[PDB]
């Protein structure tokens, strides 16, 4: 099936409580197979999933040294950001990054994600053709000019043409009990009290891995978006991306509204009422 492998970095400044913290995790399917934290007694790539524990120690120690190297480099990146971002060292701004490979049903690579985010707002991203960048604004434009005179695109292109494919296939060998890595969401519905006369209903979809998921609401068969809160895809913090869409409706019309999920992890735009 169409698979995906993701590594997540997260750097943040914390003056008054030490130095900029750094965190890293690794996800195959909905399975966390390696964690990392700079605020640990031994910031090692630690074993998590009972199938990664059979890999060569060279992989583990090399990825741990890579974690510390990225800690240093992204502390420097937090510095260079804070320098020409017109911000203070009394405050704290977080930067996050997610990068990995997405492959089709035969393990053949679809593409490779490598996207940043700054203070919740998006920062920069790599396109599918691996030959162009997508920025956000003037400073992200500076970083795009830096990495466009430095081809991280072709770097990751030839990287996923050799390393991510082998790693993902080896991890598929480590666990053939699931052929689902491009994670569909895990969904439910929250009720919020408006007492006897009305109710707030929220269709929640979490757990998944990507971000572009078209969440809609349909009344009978009519698309009603005027009364719906479709907030941006906000991850959970444990790298299980989340989202929901709600409505304060009177205690009655709630049945006419139906949730709709368009995603490629889910085999179809599924209809939802939980």
């Amino acid at each position: 099936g169409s698979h995906s492998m993701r590594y997540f970095y997260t750097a943040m400044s914390r003056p008054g409580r030490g130095e900029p913290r750094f965190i890293t995790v690794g996800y195959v399917d909905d399975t966390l197979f390696v964690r990392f934290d700079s605020d640990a007694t031994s910031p090692r790539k630690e074993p998590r999933a009972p199938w990664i524990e059979q890999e060569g120690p060279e992989y583990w120690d090399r990825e741990t040294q890579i974690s510390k190297t990225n800690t240093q480099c992204y502390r420097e990146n937090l510095r260079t950001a804070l320098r020409y971002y017109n911000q203070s060292e009394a405050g704290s701004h977080i930067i996050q990054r997610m990068y990995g490979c997405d492959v089709g049903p035969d393990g053949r690579l679809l593409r490779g994600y490598d996207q940043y985010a700054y203070d919740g707002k998006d920062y920069i991203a790599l396109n599918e053709d691996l030959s162009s960048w997508t920025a956000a604004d003037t400073a992200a434009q500076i970083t795009q000019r830096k990495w466009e005179a430095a081809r991280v695109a072709e770097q990751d292109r030839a990287y996923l043409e050799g390393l991510c494919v082998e790693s993902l296939r080896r991890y598929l060998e480590n666990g053939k009990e699931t052929l689902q890595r491009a994670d569909p969401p895990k969904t439910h519905v929250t009720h919020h009290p408006i007492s006897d006369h009305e109710v707030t209903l929220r269709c929640w979809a979490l757990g998944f891995y990507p971000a572009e998921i078209t969440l809609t609401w349909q009344r009978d068969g009519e698309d009603q978006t005027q009364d719906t809160e479709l907030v941006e895809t906000r991850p959970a913090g444990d790298r299980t991306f989340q989202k929901w869409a709600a409505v304060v409706v009177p205690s009655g019309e709630e049945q006419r509204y139906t949730c709709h999920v368009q995603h490629e992890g889910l085999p179809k735009p599924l209809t939802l009422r939980w």
Binding site: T10, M12, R21, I23, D37, D39, I94, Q96, R234, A236, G237, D238, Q242
Partner: peptide, 8 residues
């Protein structure tokens, strides 16, 4: 509490 980074 929910929806943020880091874990600690």
């Amino acid at each position: 509490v929910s929806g943020f980074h880091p874990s600690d």
